[PDB]
Amino acid sequence: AAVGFSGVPSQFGRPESGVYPAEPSEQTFLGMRGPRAPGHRENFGGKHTATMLAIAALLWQPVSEAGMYRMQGDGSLTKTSFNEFEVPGFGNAKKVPTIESLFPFSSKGFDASPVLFGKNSMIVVEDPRDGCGAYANSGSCHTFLDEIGDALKA
Amino acid sequence: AMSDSVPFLKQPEALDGSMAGDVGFDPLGFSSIGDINFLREAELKHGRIAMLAAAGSIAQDIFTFPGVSKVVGTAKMTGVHDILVKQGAMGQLLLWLSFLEVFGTIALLETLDGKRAPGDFKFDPLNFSKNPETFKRYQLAEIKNGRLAMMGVGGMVHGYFITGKGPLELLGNF
Amino acid sequence: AKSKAVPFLSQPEALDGSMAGDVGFDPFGFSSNFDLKWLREAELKHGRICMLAATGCLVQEVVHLPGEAFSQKMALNAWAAAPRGGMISILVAIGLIELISNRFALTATDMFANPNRVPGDLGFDPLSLGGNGANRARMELAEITHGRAAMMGFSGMVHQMLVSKQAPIEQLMHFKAV
Amino acid sequence: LYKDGKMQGKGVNIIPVFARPDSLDGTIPGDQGFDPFGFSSWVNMKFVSEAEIKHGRLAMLAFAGIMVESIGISFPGATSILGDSKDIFEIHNKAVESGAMGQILLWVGFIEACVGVPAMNEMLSGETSRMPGDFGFDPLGLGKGDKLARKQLVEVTNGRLAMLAVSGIVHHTIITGKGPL
Amino acid sequence: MDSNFLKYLSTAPVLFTVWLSFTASFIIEANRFFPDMLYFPM
Amino acid sequence: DVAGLTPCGESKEFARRLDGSVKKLQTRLKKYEAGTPPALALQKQIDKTKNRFDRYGKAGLLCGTDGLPHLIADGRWSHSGEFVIPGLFFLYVAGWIGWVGRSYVLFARTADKPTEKEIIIDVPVALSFVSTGFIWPFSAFKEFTSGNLIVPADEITVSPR
Ligand code: CLA
Ligand code: CLA
Ligand code: CLA
Ligand SMILES: CC1=C(C#C/C(C)=C/C=C/C(C)=C/C=C/C=C(C)/C=C/C=C(\C)C#CC2=C(C)C[C@@H](O)CC2(C)C)C(C)(C)C[C@H](O)C1
Ligand SMILES: CC1=C(C#C\C(C)=C/C=C/C(C)=C/C=C/C=C(C)/C=C/C=C(\C)C#CC2=C(C)C[C@@H](O)CC2(C)C)C(C)(C)C[C@H](O)C1
């Protein structure tokens, strides 16, 4: 009458809903399959999501390198934070929230780049194999195959 | 119903022979998982980018633009990347290629709808493909050169990783 | 009438070869006491978490995010060294994903209340890689086999990390018997 | 030739102390009525047939390579990095440390993953009616109508003989310390 | 397993004893591995 | 600090309690030979006493003039782990137990013989119910707002007034 873990509320005497929507087959790139309003997968389907992700990735690039770049006498550029940008007409609030308030990379010590990971925030790759081989190693490298071989030869 | 390229394997069902370069070559059945339009758009983009990168490696061995030698020094191939990241060149390149790739994303989704051929940006300002036959020959040549340049630029950059020469210096020096 | 995996035992009822990975292996009679839909959903969830977990236990040793807090090659050290607010964010986000992906039907009395809800079918196909009809059963078999293999591998990797105090690959390269 | 009932097929038993099982169909090349442990009753015959063929061809290439490398014949410049000795085990380790056998492993594994796995899977699933060991490889054109056997049967018999020969040669090199010939 | 023996095992005193022993064993093992927890550490 | 109490890591009477406990165990330790199992057991008890007093002294607990930790339970966040957070843990577990018991009672009402379900538990269904209890506050509140928790006063038996 009521199989364990069946998940049907009527078998457990639980208040059900009755209205159970059909499952449509339409799919969204960064969304989920499921019941939606009419017009939804045509206005916010995979095309809209991919376009908005593309536009967000494009607009990330000036946002990642956000700052006041000022040319010097030698033609070099000095980057200084938008937190030092002062405004004339808001009373005692000379410093105001800027785009760097919403994206505070330097507060966390994160060297952001237009491709997210920057020079001083580079992804660290190191080879775990320690420059030795799978078998027949003489030195500071004693692998599992070497352990098998030494166990057999004793 | 067997593959022409690999005669002991079946012809993949998503492959039909319509696309340029179709020889029934998909032994691992990648076209059964992904869309063939997405796959052809990806193949054309990888191939065109690799053709440009191969020609770039050859010409950057051959010569450099005025003033690049001062900023770069005696650095070739991927070794310039980091330097030109500290300089503003690669950021500007990424900005404008990202701007192009936004409309590339819209074009890819249009292709996935089925309103646009994969890799068809209708960019023929010199009207090279007047005849449909010339169009077919240029399509086959484009896909073949793109695949060849994919292999070529892979070889060039990994040979640079081994010797630090450059594709044309390595030929003239072992 | 006998189980194919275990030939000296009778074939378990409610196992009839319909599901992927069904070889008639249920000697303890879990499917005779609990519903197969919940068991399959749980098996797929444990397997998918273990796929991600085994892949992490191998990859995090080789590849790290920048920073001191992400520099632990051994995964049990990376559990403690990683920033705590980030891991609490991971917990909260997993909770929200579990809440919304099951569409507020999370329990043993209301998940599968909708007759269209299929075990392990959360509706997740971001790139629509399932658009092939004869591919489907082989795909589900490959997914459940990867999940079972990942469960066994990750269980072993955690307890061998406890025994050896070494990350898995560098334990295989610097092996010390007990 | 195909010699059904003399060299292959039903009714042929080369070792009559173990009777030929009823499970063997006689269609497979090399069927000479030898299955004492009754594996043919439960295994998939196409898979184990392809496995026998692959083990055999690998052992044939292994015998040819082992003999040509233990007698002393070498490619030009190949002695220098790989050692001027004749011992096959040290040749394996030297070519591993040089990287030669890594390249061999990479390319053989690439071939095996790219076409070998799909050929085995489509043969077993029943999508191509491909026979075991059939990779469609006849560049020089030696079997067209003589393909039934006197090509297949001699291939499997030489494969099995090469398997036994390579196993014997390896363990003799281990116990003696000297390569064959 | 006999269904009547399982039904006997499902009776209130047996399940009560098993569940309370299981709970007691949790409290005992938690206090064995983490003793003297007068407070939640914060 | 709070209510005139001092932190336990600087209270001299806390140290006196620790010293007295360690000395009381050490005078028992003195009568046994080194390496004997009573000696190892007593030394383990000494180690546990030292670790407990160290942990209590480094936890921000307040000690009174008696020398024992005193808990603050007025709601202040500097002592939220002494009553408030154990209270939240209890309330979660207790609401779990109440919710799964109520769910099993309402299931048993639907059976052929409800009282048999009360004395002979349907173990798979009960295990399903005890699994359901992890989201008991939201489930109980939705049960309340849908009119499925509270029953009206005209449907409950009452004595003559
Ligand atoms: C009209 C749009 C536009 C604008 C306003 C800029 C603006 C700038 N670019 Mg830029 N760029 C653009 C389009 C544009 N770019 C495109 C489409 C590309 C190719 C994807 C690039 C690639 C690029 C690189 C690689 C570099 C810049 C740099 C710069 C900066 C130079 C500042 C300076 O003092 O140089 C003043 C210079 C001049 C007044 C003379 C420059 C004349 C050049 C040599 C002519 C080049 C012709 C070229 C071959 C034609 C392009 C066709 C191509 C699409 C095939 C400046 C912010 C540089 C930078 O960031 O340095 C800090 C840098 O290294 N850009
Ligand atoms: C079971 C999964 C799991 C868990 C719990 C962890 C846990 C951790 N990882 Mg790890 N990781 C995993 C899988 C996992 N990993 C996988 C599969 C990869 C390969 C892509 C990595 C690669 C990785 C790197 C490179 C690093 C860590 C690091 C860390 C630590 C800090 C957190 C962080 O920065 O994450 C970073 C996480 C990622 C880069 C990728 C996580 C993506 C996961 C699998 C989520 C994808 C599924 C998601 C839930 C969507 C499904 C929804 C759908 C079902 C509805 C932490 C201990 C850092 C560390 O301490 O170094 C040792 C670090 O530097 N992880
Ligand atoms: C299903 C379990 C359940 C639930 C939800 C309630 C709910 C309630 N009881 Mg009640 N009660 C129960 C069982 C339960 N009771 C049992 C078994 C007894 C006999 C010992 C009592 C004896 C009792 C008294 C004497 C009083 C309450 C009171 C109350 C109310 C306040 C909460 C309270 O004081 O809890 C405290 C509850 C207890 C001390 C007894 C609980 C005994 C166990 C721990 C609970 C049963 C768990 C059960 C085995 C779960 C099986 C489920 C499984 C099969 C899936 C509330 C309406 C009080 C009231 O009227 O307040 C307005 C009150 O004065 N109850
Ligand atoms: C269509 C469009 C336009 C067009 C356009 C575009 C600009 C077309 C121009 C295209 C060029 C970029 C095609 C590039 C081909 C590169 C080859 C295949 C790579 C070869 C590598 C191999 C041989 C190798 C390598 C080797 C190894 C690995 C390592 C080295 O040590 C040695 C070596 C180098 C030998 C135009 C303007 C006409 C207008 C038209 O209306 C519309
Ligand atoms: C659904 C699909 C999605 C996809 C997705 C996801 C990302 C797919 C990825 C699935 C990945 C995570 C598969 C992971 C497999 C790991 C398992 C098989 C193995 C562990 C090995 C064991 C045997 C071991 C270990 C061993 C241990 C015990 C002892 C050691 O001494 C040795 C050793 C280490 C060898 C995407 C996003 C593409 C979108 C698409 O629209 C829909």
Coordinates of C-alpha atoms and ligand atoms in Angstrom, one line a residue, chain B residues 47-48 50-56 58 123-129 142 144-157 159 166-171, ligand 4:
Chain B
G47 CA 41.1 26.2 -38.4
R48 CA 40.9 29.9 -39.4
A50 CA 45.3 28.3 -36.7
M51 CA 45.8 29.5 -40.3
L52 CA 46.3 33.0 -39.0
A53 CA 48.6 31.7 -36.2
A54 CA 50.7 29.6 -38.6
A55 CA 51.2 32.6 -41.0
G56 CA 51.9 34.8 -38.0
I58 CA 56.2 32.3 -40.2
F123 CA 32.4 37.8 -45.8
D124 CA 33.3 37.9 -49.4
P125 CA 34.2 41.6 -50.2
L126 CA 36.2 40.6 -53.3
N127 CA 33.5 38.2 -54.7
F128 CA 35.8 35.3 -55.0
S129 CA 33.1 32.6 -55.0
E142 CA 39.5 26.3 -46.7
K144 CA 41.8 21.3 -45.7
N145 CA 44.1 24.3 -45.1
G146 CA 42.5 24.9 -41.7
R147 CA 43.0 21.3 -40.5
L148 CA 46.6 21.4 -41.9
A149 CA 47.3 24.6 -40.2
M150 CA 45.9 23.3 -36.9
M151 CA 48.5 20.5 -37.1
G152 CA 51.2 22.9 -38.3
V153 CA 50.8 25.5 -35.5
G154 CA 50.7 22.7 -33.0
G155 CA 54.0 21.5 -34.3
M156 CA 55.5 25.0 -34.4
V157 CA 54.6 26.0 -30.8
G159 CA 59.0 22.8 -31.3
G166 CA 60.9 29.5 -34.1
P167 CA 59.5 27.6 -37.0
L168 CA 61.8 29.0 -39.6
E169 CA 64.9 29.1 -37.4
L170 CA 64.5 25.4 -36.5
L171 CA 64.6 24.5 -40.2
Ligands
LIG4 C1 38.2 34.9 -47.6 C2 38.3 36.4 -47.4 C3 39.8 36.9 -47.5 C4 40.8 35.7 -47.4 C5 41.5 35.7 -46.2 C6 42.5 35.1 -45.3 C7 43.5 36.2 -44.9 C8 43.2 33.9 -46.0 C9 44.8 33.9 -45.8 C10 45.3 32.8 -45.2 C11 46.5 32.0 -44.7 C12 46.7 32.4 -43.3 C13 46.3 30.5 -44.8 C14 47.4 29.7 -43.9 C15 47.8 28.5 -44.1 C16 48.9 28.0 -43.2 C17 49.4 26.6 -43.4 C18 48.3 25.6 -43.9 C19 50.0 26.0 -42.1 C20 51.0 25.3 -42.7 C21 51.8 24.6 -41.6 C22 52.6 23.3 -42.0 C23 52.9 23.3 -43.5 C24 53.9 23.3 -41.2 C25 54.7 23.7 -40.2 C26 56.1 23.0 -40.2 C27 56.4 22.4 -38.8 C28 55.1 22.1 -38.0 C29 57.3 23.3 -37.8 C30 58.4 24.2 -38.5 O1 59.6 24.0 -37.8 C31 58.6 23.9 -40.0 C32 57.2 24.0 -40.8 C33 56.8 25.5 -40.8 C34 57.5 23.6 -42.2 C35 40.2 37.7 -48.7 C36 41.2 38.8 -48.2 C37 40.8 36.9 -49.8 C38 39.0 38.5 -49.4 C39 37.9 37.5 -49.6 O2 36.9 38.1 -50.4 C40 37.3 37.1 -48.3

